[PDB]
Design a binder for this molecule. Structure first.
Ligand SMILES: [Mg+2]
Ligand SMILES: [Mg+2]
Ligand SMILES: [Mg+2]
Ligand SMILES: [Mg+2]
Length: 328
RNA sequence: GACAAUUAACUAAAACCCCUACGCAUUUAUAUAGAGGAGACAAGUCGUAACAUGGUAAGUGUACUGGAAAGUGCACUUGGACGAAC
């Protein structure tokens, strides 16, 4: 899928007149273009020019041009990063991202990420799955390969996983729970409300909405009990964390609605009251390999109208600088 | 008397920055080597200028002169007189 955008509609092939000129407007504090940076990102050919586009993508965010870092500016930093090693830096720019700022929720996430299975990347792609969750996303079909990835190392670690990592799995299983094609789209989200549910009782309800966007209401375990009832319209772990509360700071609630360190019985008895019928009416990681095999027709159609739309965003973003050196 | 008159711009924006006046100059006041005036009065001195026709009627203007009041010329004044029939 490399050979579809790289007809770049040829421009100049130097950087050292240009990664100089991107600083002499920054000694005088003057804003720069969206298109002096694009000519700098389109001249990476080594590991060092990754850095010279990295130290200079530091300074476009911290500039008068806070925006006007295009979508096609972003991906030509990615699409030119996966040439050499594709190991650390494009992972790093979403690790920091606050002085780097890409937020690529398009098929441009997919082009970096689907390369990472070829090097299998368990401890490297451990974090980008956590840190593509730092944006709200998922009208594109990349919801499946995400939850295909998270169940690969979920069974690998059987711990509390961190002070913070367990609630990230819940957000990396709840907000990916838009796969309504099967009972899996409600039984994955069954687990998604589940492992948010324990920690607030252990730690406090403020831990849910600390950095990533989930709602703040004490109803999370209840929402499973309303989507355990959506599989009844048409799995072992949730017993054991629940009984753990049945076994041996800023407050935001009022008083006839009691706290959920006093809501032990109805959280237990209702979990059996349909489990008795869940066995009456009608494994996790193997089937999504078939959901890899059966779904995802690989809609490159939205990519290829975008590259022409990037070409529709291309010329009129330079021919503005065509008049500006013939009207003087 | 100066300078600035630029980039950047699917949201719009960031950047803008000079200076030369003051000197025992300019204006009034205080202080003074020295010179001069006016006023006052515990007692001097030289005259006798004025007040009576003040012993040359007094005075004004002005000039000249003299220890000092003053003197005199020239022209005015009565704020002097001429004694009021012959
Ligand atoms: Mg006499
Ligand atoms: Mg006489
Ligand atoms: Mg004589
Ligand atoms: Mg004579």
């Amino acid at each position: 899928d490399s050979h579809k955008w790289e007809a770049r509609e040829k421009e100049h092939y130097c950087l050292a007149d240009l990664a100089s000129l991107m600083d002499k407007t920054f000694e005088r504090k003057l804003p720069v273009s969206s298109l002096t940076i694009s000519r700098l990102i389109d001249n990476i050919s080594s590991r060092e020019e990754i850095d010279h586009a990295e130290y200079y993508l530091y300074k476009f965010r911290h500039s008068p041009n806070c925006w006007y870092l295009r979508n096609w500016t972003i991906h030509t930093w990615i699409r030119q990063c996966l040439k050499y090693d594709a190991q650390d830096k494009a992972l790093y720019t979403l690790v920091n991202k606050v002085q780097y700022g890409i937020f690529p929720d398009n098929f441009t996430f997919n082009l970096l990420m689907d390369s990472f299975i070829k090097k299998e990347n368990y401890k490297d792609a451990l974090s980008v799955v956590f840190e593509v969750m730092m944006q709200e996303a998922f009208e594109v079909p990349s919801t499946q390969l995400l939850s295909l990835y998270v169940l690969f190392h979920c069974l690998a670690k059987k711990t509390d996983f961190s002070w913070e990592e367990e609630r990230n799995f819940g957000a990396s299983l709840l907000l990916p729970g838009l796969k309504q094609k099967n009972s899996v789209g409600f039984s994955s989200q069954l687990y998604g409300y589940a492992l948010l549910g324990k920690v607030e009782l252990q730690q406090g309800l403020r831990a849910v909405y600390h950095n990533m966007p989930l709602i703040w209401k004490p109803g999370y375990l209840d929402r499973a009990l309303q989507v355990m009832e959506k599989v009844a319209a048409s799995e072992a772990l949730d017993v054991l964390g629940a009984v753990l509360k049945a076994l041996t700071k800023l407050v935001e609630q009022l008083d006839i609605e009691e706290t959920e360190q006093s809501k032990l019985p109805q959280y237990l008895e209702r979990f059996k009251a349909l489990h008795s019928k869940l066995q009456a009416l009608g494994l996790t990681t193997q089937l999504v390999k078939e959901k890899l095999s059966t779904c995802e027709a690989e809609d490159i159609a939205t990519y290829e109208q975008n590259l022409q739309q990037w070409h529709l965003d291309l010329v009129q973003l330079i021919q503005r600088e065509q008049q500006q050196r013939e009207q003087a």
